[model samples]
Target: SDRLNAGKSLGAGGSLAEGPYLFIMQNDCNLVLYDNNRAVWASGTNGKASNCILKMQRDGNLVIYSGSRAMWASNTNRQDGNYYLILQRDRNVVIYDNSNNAIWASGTNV
Candidate 1:
């Protein structure tokens, strides 16, 4: 799926791709963005974490959890449901509220 709904997640080696852009949850415990396999952005949570889990929680927090330890967060918890995290074609990874608006994003564009 293009969007990760509430309670949805990307585990190790999980990915979402849109044409030349890719958003992947690395086995090394980082969430990374790539254009044609060239890395452009990443979640700084790595190594110390065993296997990273990236989730779009029910409250709208797009976070990276190392076994739920909250390794990194997108800071977009609007305190609601129906939110999703998505990788756009423009090399952006964003969290949104049911298409009503844009909440948070990794500012990766090329």
Candidate 2:
């Protein structure tokens, strides 16, 4: 048996207003960010990546450019499935696995 709650349905834009977004997942699962009706960025189960500015980029490329130089991108070559996102005001993004372990993140090691 999987022995896990393996999925999540983001509140349908009912609360997600427009503005600069900062997302972080803290749980055993993947992070998936969707837009309107399309799938945007997806992080593997247990990890964190910031500035997932999903614009007119490629399918899995969460590109972020700072003036001319790129800042950050979460191209882990992994798919989204199950996790939690927690964005802190301290500009820190974290993702945790089901075991509550800091498997991957932008501020820590996997």
Candidate 3:
């Protein structure tokens, strides 16, 4: 599932028993993280995206690595053509970027 609707997980699994997976949501609701179908984490609005990337970062943020590279972040109320957002799981929230560095985060602003 590439696009998620409101109030849903990206997949149909019940647990995170798998090694690693990517979940992306593109609506106005929360991206509920499900492992094998069980709820592990739920990110509120910042998880929402028109287009986003979910990748495991070395810093432990299972992040939504956008391609803009300007570090704009998702949680903040900023939008630009050069801005993007990511969901850093270990960071326990979503982040915004231009594509390279973090400019805003769900953890910091919320």
Instruction: Give lDDT per model, in order.
Output: 0.81, 0.33, 0.36
Task: Give the top-scoring candidate (lDDT).
Answer: 1
Clashing residue pairs in candidate 1 are: none
- After TM-score superposition, the amount by which residue 101's alpha carbon in candidate 3 deviates from its true location, in angstroms, is 2.3
Candidate 2 weakest lDDT stretch, 10 residues: 9-18
Model 1: weakest 10-residue lDDT segment is: 43-52
Q: How do the predictions measure up, each by TM-score?
A: 0.90, 0.28, 0.32
Of the candidates numbered 1 and 3, which has the greater TM-score value? Answer: 1
The CA lDDT at 57 in model 1 is: 91
Q: Candidate 3: global Cα-lDDT?
A: 0.36
* Residue range 1-110, candidate 1, lDDT tens digits: 56678888889998888887888889998788888868889887668587888887999888888875988887775777798778887777788787658888888865
Candidate 2 per-residue lDDT over residues 27-64, each given as its tens digit: 32334433334334444533333322222122222334
* Every candidate's CA RMSD: 1.4, 13.6, 11.0
Of the candidates numbered 2 and 3, which has the greater lDDT value?
Answer: 3
The candidate 3 region of ten consecutive residues with least summed lDDT is: 6-15
Question: What is the TM-score ranking, best to worst?
Answer: 1, 3, 2
Model 1 lDDT at residue 19? 83
